[PDB]
Backbone:
């Protein structure tokens, strides 16, 4: 969160929160309601977002879902869809927090290690999250979509 | 550290569930308290030295602690004690901002009781002193956020005990 | 139906429907497929929902199934299930219509008079309707549950 | 009073009181002493009459006073006894009045709406009044029971 | 007739000017918060009977008002009292959906104080019953929607007093 | 009794009864007549109280009186009501004594052993005693009902 | 297990394992093959055992499925069947271990406390486990059923 | 263990003052509210099993904690949880009668957080259960004594946090 980011930095500097940082958390608390609304719409339409974006991912890269790909067979392809669902959930956490901090902990650390060892192509995973970002943009208003776009963008950048 | 936002989202994450409507109510409550909390944090930030001064006067000074052989005697130890009281004030204010006592648990309380018992620091005097800080802080930041600061001050007292 | 209510207003006005009224008709036309899909789910799982809701209603208001209650004995309890099924089917018809007007015409007009004369408690019948709404929420998607819950809630208010 | 009801009819008719209407007023004047004596008996035996009636009503419908019932608990049971006592006092007023005019304005207009709002069972209230009628017949003379029973019966019908 | 969007349009019509950026922003805010308002309004309608029951229990019941001679002693007065609260809530929810406090003043608050004064209804008791409804409605609707509902409920109370 | 409890505790000290203990004896002995009246009312209406408690207990817990339960058949139901009658007799004893030592001695020591050996459900017995409390309190005056509630409350608290 | 019970007694008496205890362990390790075979049959037939025994439990004790009983309604009945499944799993564990202490540690210590809190009747649960023993005896050979039945017998005895 | 009465007299003793008018006002308040405290204690005593049952149902049953691999799984562990919940209820009732949280501090909270951290007991779930008991007991004892109880239940929640 913005609050945790400020407090961690200031704690390292052994300094009561700088006046500017106090203003920053003041702005965060005012903006919080908009953040919660964005999370509300994304989580309410979570099944739509994951389902249609997953269809887009498999359509764009059929080799990934073809036999011999990591998501080959009903079981494996279902788990791949579950990973897309996981990353949407983490994005909602990030939107509420107002910073990547939650997503950059729960996921996005050692994702390369986990997936590369898992066998999956991480660029393909990035394409899947890109598709989710497009669907979310359709479901969001222009300014709201920009912020949620930022959190999705952080995910895909970490993937790449 | 977990602030209230991080605690809510991590509690939901452990179960694996998206942020529920009840969790949203928790987060909304934190956002509602945000203004009074930030205002109080600025008050403590500017008046930190006065809070420590008043508290050390109210409780610690003119007692057996500061007489020769009392552990706060010697200018080195009087300086050290006021340093520790300001540690408590700074981390308590951090905790007021974040809304969760995990900062206190992580950065203050874990291991402090053992170090204090090893060094010989009187632990009753420390608890009385930080409670005196609570009285001063309640006056400066007002009752509503004095309600809030008390929760974290009491947390420190319980940890030291 | 939405078209039916618009027709009533147009009949009094003797004037063509305004652009907003036409937009309402267009919205109903756009969501006709969604209404049919929700009805498909409800009708398919109708019997299971009825039996589950009966268990919930009996737990919440055991006086109805207690000795001296209206639904004391197998025959009376079966009549209670049939009445709940009639209400649920009426709710499905109203959901397909998109307006509570079809359900209101079929029943809930004079329902207080009829049920009170029969001797079954109106509050207990309303509680059964609430249990049906909860079961539908469990068995349906959130977006469809939003519309279905709204029509259910109209039935609950009429029962009140 | 009976005179009050006759006056209302005469005012609507825009005519002086009819000779037969005055004759009934004369009968009410004659029966004032007997009606007052019957009312005095009811008021004298008030506590025991409604105590026995409350026991009978709770015996007839044990769910009024059982857990989950409207009057579950000592305080709510006392409130139920008060409602019965309100009705008993109204019946005594009506016996003195010689007409249904006193009761109708108090406890027989909108009573169904009020009881439905609070949640108390209207049929059980009606049975309680019937139990009062039986107790009053036991505690009154035979023709005194007939007249008092008539006023009680109008109250019971109003509850229906 | 007055609604939030309609009132912006009406002010613009008085000017004769084409839609200003400020007018567009205010109308956009109405469009933006309509979703939360609509969901809460449906919830209110569903639990309307429970709300008035809770309100009279919390404020107007088990007191002298419903005891003899209290303007609710008789069933007619009681039925009218719960009916009056029901109308208060219905037109208030109408207005809450609309977003504009003008509607309630047009219908609910037009001569209401004079009528209540003439009939002998306690103005203060009605105000406290409205406040009790405000608490119950806030509980059912939730904080975000209940805060919006509370403003228009409070406008009704202000008209009464 | 108050007298024997005070004497026993004084005996533990071996001191002659303290002035405060003697004052307690004075208070209890002075209020004894009112205690006698409370016990008299409960025993005078012992039949009505017990039977009403049976009605309410079975209505809260139909499973105890349903087939396959302990109170199935007239004889078994009668024995259940006999147990309720025994505990009402104990409650009157405890009221007169002014202490709960007689109730404990006669009926509450080892009740769990006795009842589960019989197969009877102890929590259901607790509900029945709660019904006895409510019925007896309704019969009693407000001042009297407060004390009788305490004596019933020890029984239900032991039952738990 | 036999080994752990022997070690526990020897540990509490500071005693290298006695020759008799060693002999008990020797017999147990030899019978291991038969033990595991019995457990395999029981877990393979776990669905049949639970289903048939649950039918027997409800038939023998209708009150538990009657209104007011613990297992009233589909979900409550499902949890009751799940508890029966839990106890069968514990019995398989006990058979493999050759001692009842795994059953005691998991699910039998404090069972009275847990079920009393939940409202469940302990003797009725014992009826269910007895029915499971009958079904398992039908599915097992005579020599096998005698050994497995003893573990069922301990469960019902502790839960008597 | 120290009541409000013992607390008042002990504070005056520390100051070496006879019971003054202000402290005597404190005592008058406690003596006046003692009747409500006593009756509520009787209510909770009778319904202890029901209070614990309903709280365990409202917050703990049918969840991860009771399912295998959770803390309350196994009858051993579940019986321990209901035992500890009753302990929290019983000591809260002691504290309500006395008027002071010192009984909770000395007997319950004197290491509770460390014990639960040692055994792995979920502190958050315990807090949820105690708050559930707070709701249920408020219903049973009424609001007037429910608030007085609630302060001590909140004390336990804060300590375990
Ligand atoms: C005197 C020349 C100046 C002055 C001083 C002043 N000091 C105090 C109070 C305290 N001073 C000390 C000092 C020491 N503690 C130590 O361990 C050592 C070294 C061995 C020293 C020098 C302490 C501890 C106190 C606090 C009280 C106590 O001893 O417990 C005061 C009183 C301050 C007050 O308002 O409380 C004063 C006035 N004041 C002057 O005007 C001089 C210039
Ligand atoms: C079936 C034979 C009887 C019956 C039982 C019944 N039980 C419950 C609820 C629970 N039972 C358990 C049991 C266990 N937990 C354990 O860890 C173990 C050992 C491994 C056992 C045996 C638990 C935890 C519950 C609580 C719910 C949950 O699992 O989370 C119910 C539901 C009661 C309720 O309303 O909560 C019922 C009905 N009922 C019967 O009629 C039979 C006689
Ligand atoms: C119930 C709400 C939650 C829970 C708790 C749980 N606790 C234990 C075991 C212990 N509890 C204590 C606690 C206390 N000691 C005290 O003196 C007091 C105050 C009077 C308290 C609260 C202790 C010391 C133990 C260990 C010894 C024992 O088992 O009694 C367990 C059992 C854990 C075990 O390993 O056996 C459990 C499960 N568990 C939950 O799931 C709830 C959220
Ligand atoms: C002059 C006409 C008139 C009447 C009669 C009247 C009665 C009346 N009964 C009430 C309550 C009540 N009335 C009942 C009634 C019953 N419960 C039962 O089990 C029985 C079947 C039944 C009566 C025999 C109950 C249970 C309550 C309390 C509701 C509650 O608080 O839960 C209340 C609300 C609480 C209060 O007194 O403030 C009123 C006003 N008021 C009036 O103006």
Residues:
């Amino acid at each position: 969160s913005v609050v945790t980011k400020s407090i961690v930095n200031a704690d390292a500097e052994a300094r009561y929160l700088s006046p500017g940082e106090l203003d920053r958390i003041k702005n965060f608390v005012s903006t919080g309601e908009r953040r919660l609304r964005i999370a509300q719409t994304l989580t309410e339409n979570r099944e739509r977002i994951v389902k249609q974006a997953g269809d887009q991912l498999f359509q764009k890269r059929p080799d990934v879902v073809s036999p011999g790909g990591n998501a080959y067979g009903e079981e494996m392809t279902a788990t791949c869809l579950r990973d897309l669902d996981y990353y949407l959930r983490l994005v909602t956490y990030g939107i509420v927090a107002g910073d990547v901090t939650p997503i950059e902990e729960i996921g996005l650390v050692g994702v390369r290690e986990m997936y590369n060892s898992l066998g999956t192509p991480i660029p393909a995973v990035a394409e899947g999250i890109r598709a989710m970002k497009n669907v979310a943009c359709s479901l969001l208003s222009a300014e709201d979509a920009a912020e949620a776009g930022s959190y999705f963008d952080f995910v895909i950048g970490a993937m790449q | 550290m977990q602030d209230a936002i991080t605690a809510v989202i991590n509690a939901s994450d452990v179960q694996g569930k998206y942020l529920d409507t009840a969790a949203m109510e928790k987060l909304k409550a934190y956002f509602a308290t945000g203004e009074l909390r930030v205002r109080a944090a600025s008050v403590i930030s500017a008046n930190a030295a006065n809070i420590v001064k008043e508290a050390v006067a109210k409780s610690l000074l003119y007692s057996d602690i500061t007489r020769p052989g009392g552990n706060m005697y010697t200018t080195r130890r009087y300086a050290a004690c006021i340093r520790d009281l300001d540690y408590y004030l700074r981390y308590a204010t951090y905790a007021m901002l974040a809304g969760d006592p995990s900062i206190l648990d992580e950065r203050v309380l874990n291991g402090l009781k053992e170090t204090y018992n090893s060094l010989g620091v009187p632990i009753a005097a420390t608890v009385q002193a930080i409670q005196a800080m609570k009285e001063v802080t309640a006056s400066l930041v007002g009752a509503d956020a004095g309600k809030e600061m008390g929760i974290y001050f009491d947390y420190i007292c319980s940890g030291l005990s």
Remarks:
- The interface with chain E takes residues 150, 153-154, 156-157, 160 of chain C (CB under 8 Å).
- Residues 86 and 107 of chain C are 10 Å apart (CA to CA).
- Residues H 60, 65, 71-72, 76-77, 80-81, 84-85, 87, 107-108, 112, 115, 119, 121-122, 125-126, 129 surround phycocyanobilin (ligand 3) (CB under 6 Å).
- Chain C is about 80% helix and 0% strand.
